[PDB]
Structure 1
Amino acid sequence: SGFRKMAFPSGKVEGCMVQVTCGTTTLNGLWLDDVVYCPRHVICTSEDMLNPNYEDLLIRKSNHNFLVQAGNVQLRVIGHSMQNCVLKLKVDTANPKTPKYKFVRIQPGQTFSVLACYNGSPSGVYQCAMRHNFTIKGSFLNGSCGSVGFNIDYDCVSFCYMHHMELPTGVHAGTDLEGNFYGPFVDRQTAQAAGTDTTITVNVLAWLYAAVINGDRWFLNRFTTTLNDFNLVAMKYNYEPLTQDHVDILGPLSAQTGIAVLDMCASLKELLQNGMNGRTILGSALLEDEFTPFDVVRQCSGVTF
């Protein structure tokens, strides 16, 4: 019993983190096989960041402008190339700790673990959700660029995020591991800001099922609503529309608890309309939207890796 914001064990990713230095800038790289991946803005100066042309900036660099350190062992760079907004640094040694891995791009509403790193050294691990405005609410200080986000499936690490920048509201933006940004953000100095965000409704419902599985039932009621009438109310509260696909994804949780999805939706509708009235759900006084249905199942059943 119990429900916590749980990250994946980070050991497989820790063995891939390196420090990359170009000029006076130092950040983190991801060392898989004989390639180190890092944000391409490692090659920029402060002056370059107003309007950089990264193609020009990279053609002016040599293999020896890049210092890669794997703990103490220096890695010799034998080639470099640009892949969208990430650099690929070819090194002369394959990482002996390379796990089975994939590069996957995630969807808004999905969660992943972040290994926050500084100077190539892991500092902490925590769980994040990709918001509907393609930002994440992370915890990142200066030097954390190149930290990666991932999921673990069986024994395979699915890398889905590398950190590039902090937006002026304190939320964070980055790329997938092919270097393509999540959302309309760019790795240069502009007026860019996060767009409006919505609450991830399917995740709130999942979390309410987690509460029922853990014995919080005070918010339940005898009512059921239709998909249509639920969405009319949830859209008024800045919640994402619920779809028949979302209902189907919630089926396993519906079966385990015996509460139909549209029956849970009637509880959510009342919670939105009345608030919580001084009570809590799974230790929170607000409706949590950063647990997916899979997160709930994995934590409320014995799944390991």
Structure 2
Amino acid sequence: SGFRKMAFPSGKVEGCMVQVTCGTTTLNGLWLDDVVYCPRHVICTSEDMLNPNYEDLLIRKSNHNFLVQAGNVQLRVIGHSMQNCVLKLKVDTANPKTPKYKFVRIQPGQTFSVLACYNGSPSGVYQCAMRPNFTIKGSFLNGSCGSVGFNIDYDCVSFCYMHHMELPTGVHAGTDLEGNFYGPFVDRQTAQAAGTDTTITVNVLAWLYAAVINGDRWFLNRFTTTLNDFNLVAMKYNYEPLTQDHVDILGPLSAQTGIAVLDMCASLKELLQNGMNGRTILGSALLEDEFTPFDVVRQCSGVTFQ
């Protein structure tokens, strides 16, 4: 019993974190086999930030311009390449602590775990969602760039995020591990805003199922509703539409609790309409949307990793 924003154990990822230094700019890199991934804006200078041309910036670099620490050990870069917005620095040493790993590009709504790092040294680990506006409500200070987000699946680290920038609204923007930004953001210091965010409806539903699994049951009703009619209420309250594919993902949870999916939809409808009346679901006074149906099942059933 109990329900926490639970992050994957971060050991597999801690042993891949390294410092990368070009000129006056120090940020984090990720070390897999004999390659170090980091945000390409490490090659920028204080005056190269307004509209940087990374292609000319990078033709002008030689390998020894890249200082890479793995701890107190000094790695040697033997070649560099740019893939979208990430630097791939081929180094002479293969990381022996490389886990089995994949690069995945995740859909808005999925969650991942973030290992926040500074100078190649992990600081902390927390759980994030990729918001519908392809930003993340993260916790990131100066020098946090290059920290990654990831999921673990038995033994494989699916890296899904690298951190690049903080937006004026305080949310965060970055890329998959092939350097494509999530969302329409660019690695330029120009005006960019986050864009209207919505609530991840299917996750709110999965969290309400977690509640039923953990003993809260006050928010239910004998009402039901159609999918069409549910979406009409959702969009008013700035929720994402719920698809039939969402309903199907929420199947196992529906069946474990005996609450039909369109029934939990009627519960949420009433919750959005009437509020929580100053009660709390799972110790939360807000409808929580950063838990996927996978997450709920991982936590309320007890899935491990090797």
TM-score over 0.5 for the pair: yes
- Residues of 2 paired with 1:304 and 1:134: CA distance? 28
- For structure 1, list consecutive stretches of 5 or more residues without a partner in the other structure: none
1:302 Cα deviation from its structure 2 partner: 2.0
Deviation at 1:278, TM superposition (A): 1.3
Q: Distance in 2 between matches of 1:244 and 1:77?
A: 49
The percentage of counterpart residues that share the same residue type is 100
Q: Distance in 2 between matches of 1:168 and 1:249?
A: 35
| CA displacement at 1:202 relative to structure 2 | 0.2
Counterpart in 2 of 1:150?
A: 150
Shift of residue 76, structure 1, vs aligned partner: 0.8
CA distance in 1, matches of 2:39, 2:171: 18
Aligned counterparts of 1:12 and 1:48: Cα–Cα separation in 2? 35
1:190 to partner: Cα distance: 1.0
Cα distance in 1 for residues equivalent to 2:198 and 2:29? 32
Give the Cα–Cα distance (whole angstroms) in 2 for the partners of residues 12 and 302 of structure 1. Answer: 20
Query: How many residue pairs end up in the alignment?
Result: 305
Q: Deviations over 1:182-228 (max 9, x none)?
A: 00000011111000011000000000000000000001111100001
How far apart, CA to CA, are the structure 2 residues paired with 1:236 and 1:224?
Answer: 19
Correspondence for 2:214: 214
Alpha-carbon distance, 1:46 to partner: 1.3
* Aligned counterpart, 1:50: 50
Deviation at 1:51, TM superposition (A): 1.0
Show CA shifts across 1:81-136 (max 9, x none).
11110001110010010000000000000000000000000000000000010000
Shift of 1:43: 0.4
Residue 48 of structure 1: SS of its match in structure 2?
Answer: coil
Deviation at 1:144, TM superposition (A): 0.2
Secondary structure at 1:47 match in 2 = coil
Q: Root-mean-square deviation (CA), in Å?
A: 0.5
Q: Distance in 1 between matches of 2:212 and 2:51?
A: 52
SS of residue matched to 2:269:
helix
Q: List structure 1 segments (4+ residues) > 3 angstroms apart after TM superposition.
A: none
Instruction: Give the CA deviation at 1:179.
Output: 0.5
Gaps of 5+ in 2: none
Partners of 2:34 and 2:263 lie apart in 1 by 53
What secondary structure is seen at the aligned counterpart in 1 of 2:20? strand
Distance in 1, Cα, partners of 2:181 & 2:116? 19
**What whole-Å deviation, never above 9, does each CA across 1:48-90 have from its counterpart, x for those lacking one?**
0001110000000000100000001100111011111000111
